[PDB]
Amino acid sequence: TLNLKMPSPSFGGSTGGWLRSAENEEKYAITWISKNEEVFEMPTAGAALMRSGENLLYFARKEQCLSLGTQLKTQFKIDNYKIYRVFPNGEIQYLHPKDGVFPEKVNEGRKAINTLTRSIGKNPDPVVVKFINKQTFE
Amino acid sequence: AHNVKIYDTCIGCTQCVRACPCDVLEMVPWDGCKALQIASAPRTEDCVGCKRCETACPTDFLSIRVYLGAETSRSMGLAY
Amino acid sequence: MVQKGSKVKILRKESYWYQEIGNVVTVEKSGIKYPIIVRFDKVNYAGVNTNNFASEEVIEIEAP
Amino acid sequence: EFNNLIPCKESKIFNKRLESTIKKLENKLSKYEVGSSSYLAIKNTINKTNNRFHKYMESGVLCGKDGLPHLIADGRWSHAGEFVIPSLLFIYISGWIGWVGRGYLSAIKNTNKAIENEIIIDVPLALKFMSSGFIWPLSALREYTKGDLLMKDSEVTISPR
Amino acid sequence: PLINGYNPYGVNNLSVWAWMFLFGHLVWATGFMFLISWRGYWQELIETLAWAHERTPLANLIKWKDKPVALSIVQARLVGLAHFAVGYILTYAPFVIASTVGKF
Amino acid sequence: LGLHTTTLILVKGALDARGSKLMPDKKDFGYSFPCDGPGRGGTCDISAWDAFY
Amino acid sequence: KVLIDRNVVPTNFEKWSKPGHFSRSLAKGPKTTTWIWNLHADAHDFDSHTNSLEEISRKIFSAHFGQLAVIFIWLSGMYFHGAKFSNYVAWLNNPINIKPSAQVVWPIIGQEILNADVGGGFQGIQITSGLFQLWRASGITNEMQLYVTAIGGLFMASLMLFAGWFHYHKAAPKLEWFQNVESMLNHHLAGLLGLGSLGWTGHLIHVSLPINKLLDSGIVPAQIPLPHEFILNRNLMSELYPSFNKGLLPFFTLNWNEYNDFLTFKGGLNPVTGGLWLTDIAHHHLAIAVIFIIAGHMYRTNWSIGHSLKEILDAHKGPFTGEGHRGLFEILTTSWHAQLAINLAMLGSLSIIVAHHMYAMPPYPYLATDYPTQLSLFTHHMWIGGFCIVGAGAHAAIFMVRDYSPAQNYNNLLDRVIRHRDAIISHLNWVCIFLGFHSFGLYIHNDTMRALGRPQDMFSDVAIQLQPIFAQWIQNCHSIAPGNTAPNVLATTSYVFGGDIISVGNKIAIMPMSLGTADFMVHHIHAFTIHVTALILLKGVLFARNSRLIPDKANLGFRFPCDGPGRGGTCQVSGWDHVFLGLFWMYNSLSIVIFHFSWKMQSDVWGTISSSGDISHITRGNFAQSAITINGWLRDFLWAQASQVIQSYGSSSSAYGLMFLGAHFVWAFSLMFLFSGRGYWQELIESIVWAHNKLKVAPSIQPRALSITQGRAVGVAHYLLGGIATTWAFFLARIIAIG
Amino acid sequence: QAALYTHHQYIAGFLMVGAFAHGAIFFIRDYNPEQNKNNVLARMLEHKEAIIS
Numbered sequence A: 001t002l003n004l005k006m007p008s009p010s011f012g013g014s015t016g017g018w019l020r021s022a023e024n025e026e027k028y029a030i031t032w033i034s035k036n037e038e039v040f041e042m043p044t045a046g047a048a049l050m051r052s053g054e055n056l057l058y059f060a061r062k063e064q065c066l067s068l069g070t071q072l073k074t075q076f077k078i079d080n081y082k083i084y085r086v087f088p089n090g091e092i093q094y095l096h097p098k099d100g101v102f103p104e105k106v107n108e109g110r111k112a113i114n115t116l117t118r119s120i121g122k123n124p125d126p127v128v129v130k131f132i133n134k135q136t137f138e
Numbered sequence B: 001a002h003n004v005k006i007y008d009t010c011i012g013c014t015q016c017v018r019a020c021p022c023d024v025l026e027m028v029p030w031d032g033c034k035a036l037q038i039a040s041a042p043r044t045e046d047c048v049g050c051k052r053c054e055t056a057c058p059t060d061f062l063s064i065r066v067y068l069g070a071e072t073s074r075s076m077g078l079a080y
Numbered sequence C: 001m002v003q004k005g006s007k008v009k010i011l012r013k014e015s016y017w018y019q020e021i022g023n024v025v026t027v028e029k030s031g032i033k034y035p036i037i038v039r040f041d042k043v044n045y046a047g048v049n050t051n052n053f054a055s056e057e058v059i060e061i062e063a064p
Numbered sequence D: 001e002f003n004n005l006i007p008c009k010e011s012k013i014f015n016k017r018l019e020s021t022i023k024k025l026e027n028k029l030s031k032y033e034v035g036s037s038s039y040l041a042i043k044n045t046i047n048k049t050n051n052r053f054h055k056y057m058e059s060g061v062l063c064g065k066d067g068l069p070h071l072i073a074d075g076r077w078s079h080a081g082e083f084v085i086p087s088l089l090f091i092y093i094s095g096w097i098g099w100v101g102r103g104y105l106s107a108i109k110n111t112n113k114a115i116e117n118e119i120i121i122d123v124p125l126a127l128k129f130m131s132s133g134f135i136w137p138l139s140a141l142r143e144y145t146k147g148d149l150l151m152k153d154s155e156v157t158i159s160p161r
Numbered sequence E: 001p002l003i004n005g006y007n008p009y010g011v012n013n014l015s016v017w018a019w020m021f022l023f024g025h026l027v028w029a030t031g032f033m034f035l036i037s038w039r040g041y042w043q044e045l046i047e048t049l050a051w052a053h054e055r056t057p058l059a060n061l062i063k064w065k066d067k068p069v070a071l072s073i074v075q076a077r078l079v080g081l082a083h084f085a086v087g088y089i090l091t092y093a094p095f096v097i098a099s100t101v102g103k104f
Numbered sequence F: 001l002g003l004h005t006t007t008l009i010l011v012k013g014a015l016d017a018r019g020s021k022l023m024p025d026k027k028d029f030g031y032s033f034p035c036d037g038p039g040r041g042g043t044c045d046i047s048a049w050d051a052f053y
Numbered sequence G: 001k002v003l004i005d006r007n008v009v010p011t012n013f014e015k016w017s018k019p020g021h022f023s024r025s026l027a028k029g030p031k032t033t034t035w036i037w038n039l040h041a042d043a044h045d046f047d048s049h050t051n052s053l054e055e056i057s058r059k060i061f062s063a064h065f066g067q068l069a070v071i072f073i074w075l076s077g078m079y080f081h082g083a084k085f086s087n088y089v090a091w092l093n094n095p096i097n098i099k100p101s102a103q104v105v106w107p108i109i110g111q112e113i114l115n116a117d118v119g120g121g122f123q124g125i126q127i128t129s130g131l132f133q134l135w136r137a138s139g140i141t142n143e144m145q146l147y148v149t150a151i152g153g154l155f156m157a158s159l160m161l162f163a164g165w166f167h168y169h170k171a172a173p174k175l176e177w178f179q180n181v182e183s184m185l186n187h188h189l190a191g192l193l194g195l196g197s198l199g200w201t202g203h204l205i206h207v208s209l210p211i212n213k214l215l216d217s218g219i220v221p222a223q224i225p226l227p228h229e230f231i232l233n234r235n236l237m238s239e240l241y242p243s244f245n246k247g248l249l250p251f252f253t254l255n256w257n258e259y260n261d262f263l264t265f266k267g268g269l270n271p272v273t274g275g276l277w278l279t280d281i282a283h284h285h286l287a288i289a290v291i292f293i294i295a296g297h298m299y300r301t302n303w304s305i306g307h308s309l310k311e312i313l314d315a316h317k318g319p320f321t322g323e324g325h326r327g328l329f330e331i332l333t334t335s336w337h338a339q340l341a342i343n344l345a346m347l348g349s350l351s352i353i354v355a356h357h358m359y360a361m362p363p364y365p366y367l368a369t370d371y372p373t374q375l376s377l378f379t380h381h382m383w384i385g386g387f388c389i390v391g392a393g394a395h396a397a398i399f400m401v402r403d404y405s406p407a408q409n410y411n412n413l414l415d416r417v418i419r420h421r422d423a424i425i426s427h428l429n430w431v432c433i434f435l436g437f438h439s440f441g442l443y444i445h446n447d448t449m450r451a452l453g454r455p456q457d458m459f460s461d462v463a464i465q466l467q468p469i470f471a472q473w474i475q476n477c478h479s480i481a482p483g484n485t486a487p488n489v490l491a492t493t494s495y496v497f498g499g500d501i502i503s504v505g506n507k508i509a510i511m512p513m514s515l516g517t518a519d520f521m522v523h524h525i526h527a528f529t530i531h532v533t534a535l536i537l538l539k540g541v542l543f544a545r546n547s548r549l550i551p552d553k554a555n556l557g558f559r560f561p562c563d564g565p566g567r568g569g570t571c572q573v574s575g576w577d578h579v580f581l582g583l584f585w586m587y588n589s590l591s592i593v594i595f596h597f598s599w600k601m602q603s604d605v606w607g608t609i610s611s612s613g614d615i616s617h618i619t620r621g622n623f624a625q626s627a628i629t630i631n632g633w634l635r636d637f638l639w640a641q642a643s644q645v646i647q648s649y650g651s652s653s654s655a656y657g658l659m660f661l662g663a664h665f666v667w668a669f670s671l672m673f674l675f676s677g678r679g680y681w682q683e684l685i686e687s688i689v690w691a692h693n694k695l696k697v698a699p700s701i702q703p704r705a706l707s708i709t710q711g712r713a714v715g716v717a718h719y720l721l722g723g724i725a726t727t728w729a730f731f732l733a734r735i736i737a738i739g
Numbered sequence H: 001q002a003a004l005y006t007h008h009q010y011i012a013g014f015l016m017v018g019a020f021a022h023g024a025i026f027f028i029r030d031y032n033p034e035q036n037k038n039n040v041l042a043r044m045l046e047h048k049e050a051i052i053s
Ligand code: CLA
Pocket: D097, D098, D099, D100, D101, D102, D104, D121, D126, D127, D129, D130, G687, G688, G689, G691, G692, G695, G697, H053
C-alpha cells in the first residue's frame, strides 16, 4: 500500500507542478527512504530538500517519477523507491519495481510479452495483410 | 498505444531495458542466447515512442522495434 | 565447417554487411539460435563491427 | 550553313565593340598624367583589349548578330579548338587524377594504416602513383579486360528489394 | 508596373495584383517557419500557454475539449510545403499578369 | 538539370520506399512516417513521403 | 599571490600529426567521415576535454594571447596598407574631394576594373572602415608614421604569441591565480581602462590637439611640425593654446579653470570638419580616467581595505527573493560559461550603443559627410552586437546544462527564476503576440487601405496619426538643455535632437531627425523583433535542463538533435536548438534596424545644401509617406535603391554586383540544409557508395551524411552569410554612388 | 497567352510529382515480390543502385 499521510520533501513550490489533468485523470506518486537530509533536483525544476526517512512526491507523468528514481539511484545511491499510479476515485496501482526486482535484472516468474520467434527480416509484405486486421509485425 | 516487439536475434544485453525512461521493458529468462535472457515489453501502455531502446540495441538489424500507433495522453507525453 | 578464423560471406539481407566478408571470432555451443560471432572491418551505422549469425546466414570462403 | 552567323573579322558589330571599349578607356586615360602609374595601368588595359579583339578576328571564330563569338560544338573539325580539343585535354587530365587516386586507395587498403593513410597521406607512395598517370587509358583498358577493374555484383553490398 | 499598382499618389487597376504579389511573399515566408523550426520547440511553448490559461482568473472558467498540442512532425512538413507552394504561385501569377498588362 | 534532379529525388523515393541499408524494414512503417529516431546516425526525412516533399 | 607551475608541457610537433589527441573519443581516429567534422566542432570545447578547472583555465588564458596576436597582425596589416597602398596623404590634403582607398588589385583576368577613380591621381577600392578619419584625428600626417605603427604591430603580435606559448608551456598560472577576481577587477578598472584613458588623454593633448588645430586652420600637412616638436618646444603649443604658458602649476594648485582653452565643454560639432571638438574629447578622457582609477580601488586584495565581492552579493536579499544573491559568487568564480554569458551580453549591447552614438555624435573629422563610412560603421557594429547577444544565450544555456547544481542554488535568485519559468515564458509569449499584432498589423492595415483607395483610413501623418510624443518630448528637453539643466555646456550633445543644420562642403553632416507616425511604427517593430529574439533565447536557457515534455533533458546535454519521434515528436528541444532559432530572429531584427537607419538617413538627413539654404535629401523625404506600407519598403527602398548594385556590371562597382548575386546564391543554398533531413541524404550516399565499391574506389573512411545538428549548423551559417553579404553589397554599391 | 502557358505547365508539374508519389505508394502497399519474380518490374529493384547512382 502507498500511505497518503507520508511526509514530503521541503520545497518552496513552482509553476512546473501538476495541473487539472492530475486531479481528474491520473497522477503518479514516488516514495523513498533517505538516510540523511539532502538537496536534489526536482524534475519539474528547482532544488528541494529530501527529509531523512520517508519521502512522498506526486507528479503528473510516470516519466517524471522514473526520472527522479534514476537521479536517486545515480546521485544518492537510493534504490528503495516505489512508484504508484493514483486515480481520482482513490484507487492505487503499484507500478515499479513491478515484482520487487528492477526490470534490468532477470527474474524467474516473468513471462515474455511481445516477443516473436523470427528475425526482423522475416516479416511478411504489407500486401499480404491487405483487407485484414493483421499487421506485418504481428 | 505504440507497438513494441522483440525479435529472436536478441542477445540479452539489457541495454534497451536500461535505456527506457518509461519502464516499458524488462528482462525475462530464455534459452535462445548465451545470456539466458531476452527483453520483454509487458507495459506498452506507458510507451512514449522515444526509441531510446532501439538506439541502445547492438544487434544488426535491431532486435527491438517500436511501431508508432494510436496516440493517448500517456503516449503524447502530456502533463496537462 | 565454420570455426574460429574462418572467413565467411554474409547472406542475411537486412544485415549492414550483406554479401560482404567477415572473420569468425567464436562459435557458441548448441541451442543458441545465432551461435556464429563475426567481426568486420567496416562499422555499421550504429558504430558496431560485430554481430551474431546462424549457419544458414553465412557461407565459408577461407579454411581456418 | 550558319547563315545567322558571320566571321568576327567580317562583323561590323564586333568591330564597333572594340571601338566603344577603347573610347571608354581613352576617356579614363585622359584623367591621369602621362608617365603616372595610373596612366600606365590604363594603357596596359588598352593594349590587352586590342590584343584580345585582334586575336579573335584572326581566328575564324563565328560571331552572332550581337557581335560576340559563338562556339560550334557539333563535332565538325573546322571548330575543333572550340570544344573537341579542350574536351580531349580535360578527359586526359581528369582521368589521370581519378586513376592515380584509385591506385593510391587500393595500395593503402593492403596495409595496417588503411585509415591513417587517408587523413595523413603517405606522400612517397602518393607521388609514385601520381607519377604513373600518363598512360592511364591503356592501364584502365587492360585492367578492364583482365577483370580487375570491377567487383562482381554479388560481392558488393545491397539493400533489400 | 506591378509594384506601382498602388502608391502614395493613388491606385490603378494593377492595385489588386500589387496586393496579391505581397500576399504571395508573405505566405511563402510563413512556410519557412514550419520548414525550419521543428516540432519540439513548439510543444514546449504550448505547455506554458496551457499553464497560463488554467491559472488566469475568469478565463479559466472556459475549458478545452481537445488538449492543445503542437502539429505533428509530418504535419509541419506538409503545412510548410503548402504555404511554400501557395506563396510561389500567388507571387508569380500577379507578376506574370501585371508585367504583361503593364508593358502592352 | 531540373528534370533529372526532380526525377532523382522521386525515383530514389520509389525504389527505396520498401527499404535501404539505413532502414531495411521500411515497408513495415508505411508511406509516411516522421522518421526512425536519432539512432544509427539520425533518420530525419527517411520515408518515401519525404522524397515527395 | 603569484602561483605558477613551471615547464608543464613540452614543445614538439609529435601531437600535430595526431588529430584529436585532445579528446578521448577522438584520439582513437576515424572509422567514418563524421569524425572529421567532430574534430573541428570539439577543438575549443576545452571543458569537454578535461574535468580539471585548472587545466581549462590555462588553455583559455593562452588562447586569449593567440586571439590578441591575430588582432595585432590584422591591425598591422591595416596600417601597412595605409602606408604602402593608399591615397592617405592626398586625402589628408583635400579630404572633401577625395575618396579614401587602401586596397589595390593586381591586373589579372580583367579584375583591374575594380581599381576605382577615387581621386588624388589614385586608383583602388574605396574603403568604408573609417581608418583615414581615425588616423587624421590621431595626428598622423605621413606614410612613415603608418609604416612604423605597422612594424610595432608585428612586434606586439610576436610578443602576444610568445606570451601565449610561455604561459601555457613554460609558466602556467594555478587556479587560485585566476580566481583572484578582486585583484583582476582593480587592475582592469584602474590599470587597463583608467591608465589607458589617461595615456590617450596624453596623446590627445600633446599630439592630436595641435596638429588638428593647424590642419583645421588650413595649414598644409607637410608644413605642420612633427609631434615631438610640440613636446620639446612648448611655445609651439602656447601659440595655439595660451594656457600652456602657465605649465603644470595650475594642476597641482587646483586652478584647473586655467586650462579651459584645451579642456572644454562645448558640445555640438567642429564646423570645419563636422566632428566633435578634440578639446571636448580630451576632457572626456581625463574625466573618465579619474573615475576609472578611483573605481579600481573598490575591491579588497592584499590589504585590509576594500570590499569583498562575496560579502556585497550575500547582503542583497529582500522579502520577495528568498536567499537573494547567495551562491552567485561561487557560480561566477567556478564557471567560465557563466562569465562568458554575462560578458558577451554586455560586449554585444555595448557594440550596439557604439553604433548609435557614433552616427549622432560623429567623433572623427570628415566622418559625418563620408556617407559610406557612416553607413558602414553603424551596420558593422550592429551586427557584431547581435551575434554577441545570441552567444550570451548559448553560454547561459551551456552553464545551465553543465555547471549548475541544485545544492549551490537553494532558494536563491537563480533557483527562484527556474521555479516560475512558465509564468515568465507565458507572459513573454503574450507580449510578443501583442507587439506583433499592434506593429506589423498596422502596416497590413495600411497596405490594405491604400490598395483599396482609402488613404484617409491609414495610420499616417496625414490621416490617423500615431505620434511618438514621448520621444518628441525627450528631443525637446535635449535641445533646450544647454545653458539650462546643463548650464556650462554651450551646444547640444547632438544636432539629431534639434537645432542647426551642420554642413561640410555642401554636404549635410547632421541635422534634426523629426519623428512621426512612420518612426512610431518602425520603433514598435524593433520592440517586437527584440522581444521575440529574447523569448527564444530565454526559453532555451530556462528549459535547458528539463521541461514537462522531457524531464531528464540535462542528461541529453546542451547539443543533441531530439529525443525521438515519440511524445508527439521532440525535434529541436535542446538548448543548442534555441540558439539556432534565435540566430534567425536576431538576423530578422537587425536587418530591419539597419534598413530603418539607411532609409531614414537618406530621406531625412543626408543630402546637399545650396548657398541660399535649400536642402536636397538623397531620397527627397519619401520616408514619411512610403515607409508606412510593406509595398513602400518593397518599392521605394528595396527596388529603388537596388538600382546601383544591379547596374554595376562593367564599372568599378562590379564586384558588388557579383557579391550581391553570389550572396543570394549562398542564401538559397542554405535552404537545402534547413528544409531537408539526413535520412534522405544517407540513403542517397548508399547508392553512390555502391558505384565506388563496384569500381574498387570506395574509401576506408566511410562516407556519412552530416549529423542532424551539423545539418542545422551548416544551414544557419549559410543563411546568415548569404543574407548579410547581400545587404553589404546592396548598401556599399548604393552609398558609394550617391554618397 | 502567358497566363495559359504558365497555368498548364504548373498543372503538369504537379501531375508528374503525383505520378511518382503513387508509384512509391504502389511499392509499399501493393507490390508482391513473390508474384513478380524476375519480371521487368522486379528487375528495376534489382539494379536500383545503378539507376540512382
Ligand atoms: C580518387 C578519387 C575518386 C574517384 C576515382 C571517383 C570516381 C567516381 N565518383 Mg566519386 N567522389 C570522390 C572521389 C572519387 N570519385 C570524393 C572525394 C567525393 C566526395 C566529394 C566523391 C563524391 C561523389 C559523388 C556525390 C558522386 C561520385 C560519383 C563518381 C563516379 C562518376 C564520376 C563523378 O561523378 O565524380 C564526381 C565527384 C566529384 C566531383 C568529387 C571530387 C573528386 C575529387 C576531386 C577527387 C579527390 C582526389 C583525391 C584527393 C586524390 C588523392 C590521390 C593521391 C593521394 C595519390 C566515379 C566512379 C558519382 C557516381 O556515383 O556515378 C555513378 C556521384 O554521384 N563521387
